Ligand SMILES: [Ca+2]
């Protein structure tokens with residue numbers, strides 16, 4: 001339940017993040033993998049290097065399967081709002097360029 005874990009976000013914000021997550025999960029498997037993340041960053045207008053994509057995932061990949069669950073996607077926005085993302089890092093750019101202002 002993301003609504004009890006991520007209290008810093010409104011329901012509308014979480015739903016918007018859910019909508020974006022689902023947009024880029026091309027295979028409907030419930031995850032964003034590296035290839036899917038590559039495509040998302042391309043379509044946001046800020047393509048990332050292969051290693052940069054890997055490092056983006058690694059920062060929030062709590063179950064070490066090299067792909068992002070919806071919970072881990074939310075962790076990106078939590079980190080952005082906790083002041084923990086490095087200036088102009090891939091994750092910072094993702095959070096900025098999404099329509100979601102946390
Ligand atoms: Ca997927």
Ligand SMILES: [Ca+2]
Nearest residue numbers: 061063065067
């Ligand atoms: Ca994972």
